[PDB]
From a paper:
PimE, the focus of our studies, is a polyprenyl-monophospho-β-d-mannose (PPM)-dependent mannosyltransferase that catalyzes the transfer of the fifth mannose from a PPM donor to the Ac1PIM4 acceptor substrate, leading to the formation of Ac1PIM5 via an α(1 → 2) glycosidic bond. PimE contains twelve TM helices with both the N- and C-termini located on the cytoplasmic side of the membrane. PimE belongs to the GT-CA subclass of glycosyltransferases, characterized by a conserved core module of seven TM helices. PimE, like many other structurally characterized GT-C enzymes, is an inverting glycosyltransferase, which is thought to operate through a single-step nucleophilic substitution mechanism facilitated by an enzymatic general base catalyst and can occur in either a metal-dependent or independent way.
We added Fab-E6 to this complex and determined its cryo-EM structure to 3.5 Å resolution following a similar flowchart to the one used for the apo structure. The resulting structure revealed an overall topology comparable to the apo structure. However, we observed two prominent and interpretable densities in the central cavity. One, close to CE1, was consistent with the phosphate group and the first three prenyl units of PPM. The absence of any density where we could fit the mannose moiety led us to interpret it as the PP portion of the PPM donor. Superposition of the apo and product-bound structures revealed close structural similarity (Cα RMSD of 1.5 Å across all 367 Cα pairs) with subtle conformational rearrangements.
Author numbering:
A (entry chain H): 1 to 117, 119 to 126
B (entry chain L): 2 to 104
C (entry chain A): 21 to 403
The structure:
């Protein structure tokens, strides 16, 4: 029933832009946090972006900070991640995954996702 | 947050319990997950919150909080359960997957 | 129509703002709108502190017919002694704003518990549920029920044992009714947090004995928290089992056999409902739904715990089941309209227990709704 589809993953010149798209079906984005995970050939997984899709908070890595801007689309159930001035070492397999974010109040809020329960297929950026 | 795991390919024998470390600096409470990724495929989540396995994952799987350190333990590789396993800390600020670890 | 749902979500801040403006205008433009009989009680109780006449105190100024007493635990008088140092209006406006902000914060905590943060949807939910009969009753009377709900859900949200225990203990010291929330922690296997909450409740009892002592004592022996002293038992507003059973009876059965059987059946129903739930918000909502039904006195303004329950129904894990949507919309239509509030007019006076079939049977409305929800949860979980 629940499926994740990734229609992005094109080839771009060193420097430029590329718009990954992670379609979702069988669930509501607003109720889950969509994450983008990349895996360069010969190297392990590396987290890229962790949009929440409900509060709209954008979290992405330091080396990812200056080159990525992850969007969201609750109406169409899509992630729609974007780059700029990429392709220095960004050749990877950008998976997209959803997770359930559970909060605790230890005198101040501290979100932490329970884990990436469902993963899409592989892309070829 | 610097992050590292056990050496890759630290358990190759079939028919025995396998252990692996999920060394994490600072303190991330119990916000750790373990994933199974066969080559040429996408990772499948094994345990969430580093204590309870996912629905559908074989009951042999078990991860436990060893203080600030985290471990993942299963029964054996009977059903051809060979894949590169990853563990992450989800502090909601900067998620790090650490080093890749093959079975 | 999910598109309209998104459109209304985006219109959250400027709908909660409208609700708050309307409420504030009504309270401070209409006579008796800002009467705040229970805030004035909280202010005039400690105002007599140190003079040996705090529980013999009565407050008939605002309701000459029924003199409002100070039935709260002495720890509540200790906590409210500072209120004695604030002018009455500076405290009334502050309390209304505090109740409103507590409603918004508790909606936000419910959203966090369900696993998603949404300020706009939280504002929309606060505006819509602001006018539910329990919430409007709390705001009218000034009773502190949204604040204790906020404290209890803050305790639930915080995994830290000391924080949750202290919050639950203090909140239960202020009022004994929210102590049933501790049962959820027993269900959650949080034995240490429950123990600390009980210890804090006992230390609040000790503080009350120390400060309000020599005037309020024997609060559990020779008094037993007698429902009659707090208020009429049979009035339709008393939506606990005792109230409805007294309506259908014409005489307060109290600890009668027939009331005991109802208590047992609702106990089993609520236990099955809790066994049918797995998320923190749903567990606490079921526990408090049961607490509202077992407490000897549960006025309408006590049923503010239904708001987190509707949030769970319309956003929790069961935001799909046909029954979940059906019962969520049922609770919304029941509370927003308010059957007990409408029926309260029919009865001659709040002290009349005898009723004919309509005014008595319709007095079991909220009891029947809660029992139906509990049975539905039990059967859907068992299946």
């Amino acid at each position: 029933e629940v499926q994740l589809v990734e229609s992005g993953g094109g080839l771009v010149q060193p420097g430029g832009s590329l718009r990954l798209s992670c379609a979702a079906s069988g669930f509501n984005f607003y109720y889950y946090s969509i994450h983008w995970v990349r895996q360069a050939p010969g190297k392990g997984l590396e987290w890229v972006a962790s949009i929440s899709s409900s509060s709209g908070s954008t979290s992405y890595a330091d080396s990812v900070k200056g080159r990525f801007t992850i969007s969201a689309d609750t109406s169409k159930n899509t992630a729609y991640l974007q780059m700029n001035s990429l392709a220095r070492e960004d050749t990877a397999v950008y998976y997209c995954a959803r997770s359930q974010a559970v909060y605790y109040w230890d005198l101040w809020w501290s979100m932490y996702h329970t884990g990436f329960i469902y993963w899409g297929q592989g892309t070829l950026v | 947050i610097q992050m590292t795991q056990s050496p890759s390919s630290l358990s190759a024998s079939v028919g025995d319990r396998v252990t692996i470390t999920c060394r994490a600096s600072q303190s991330v409470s119990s916000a750790v997950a373990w994933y199974q990724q066969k080559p040429g495929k996408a990772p499948k989540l094994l345990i969430y919150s580093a204590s309870s396995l996912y629905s559908g994952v074989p009951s042999r799987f078990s991860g436990s909080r060893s203080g600030t350190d985290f471990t993942l333990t299963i029964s054996s590789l009977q059903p051809e359960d060979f894949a590169t396993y990853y563990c992450q800390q989800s502090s909601s600020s900067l998620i790090t997957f650490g080093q890749g670890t093959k079975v | 129509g999910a598109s309209a749902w998104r459109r209304v979500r985006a219109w959250g801040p400027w709908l909660l703002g409208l609700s708050v403006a309307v409420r504030l205008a009504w309270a401070y433009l209409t006579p008796h709108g800002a009467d705040l009989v229970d805030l004035h009680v909280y202010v005039s109780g400690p105002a007599t502190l140190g003079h040996g006449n705090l529980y013999e105190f009565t407050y008939p100024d605002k309701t000459p017919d029924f003199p409002l007493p100070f039935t709260y635990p002495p720890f509540a008088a200790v906590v409210f002694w500072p209120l004695h140092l604030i002018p009455f209006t500076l405290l009334g406006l502050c309390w209304i704003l505090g109740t409103i902000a507590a409603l918004y914060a508790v909606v936000r905590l419910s959203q966090r518990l369900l696993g998603f943060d949404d300020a706009r949807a939280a504002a929309v939910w606060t505006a819509v549920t602001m006018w539910t009969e329990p919430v409007r009753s709390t705001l009218d009377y000034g009773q502190i029920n949204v604040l204790l709900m906020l404290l209890i859900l803050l305790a639930v949200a915080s995994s830290r044992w000391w924080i949750s225990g202290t919050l639950i203990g203090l909140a239960g010291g202020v009022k004994l009714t929210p102590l049933v929330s501790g049962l959820y922690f027993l269900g959650a296997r949080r034995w240490t947090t429950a123990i600390w909450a009980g210890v804090v409740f006992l230390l609040t009892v000790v503080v009350g004995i120390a400060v309000v002592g020599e005037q309020g004592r024997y609060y559990f022996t020779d008094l037993l928290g007698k429902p009659d002293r707090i208020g009429p038992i049979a009035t339709v507003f008393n939506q606990s089992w005792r109230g409805g059973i007294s309506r259908i009876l014409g005489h307060d059965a109290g600890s009668g056999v027939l009331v005991l059987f109802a208590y047992a059946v609702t106990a089993i129903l609520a236990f099955l409902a809790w066994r049918a739930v797995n998320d923190r918000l749903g567990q606490i909502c079921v526990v408090e739904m049961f607490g509202l039904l077992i407490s000897p006195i549960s006025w309408t303004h006590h049923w503010v715990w239904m708001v987190p329950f509707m949030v769970w129904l319309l956003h929790g894990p069961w935001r799909d089941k046909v029954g979940a949507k059906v019962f969520g919309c049922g609770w919304l239509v029941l509370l927003l309209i308010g059957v007990p509030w409408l029926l309260s007019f029919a009865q001659p006076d709040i002290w009349r227990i005898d009723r004919p079939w309509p005014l008595a049977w319709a007095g079991l409305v909220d009891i029947v709704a809660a029992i139906a929800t509990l049975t539905w949860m039990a059967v859907v979980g068992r299946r």
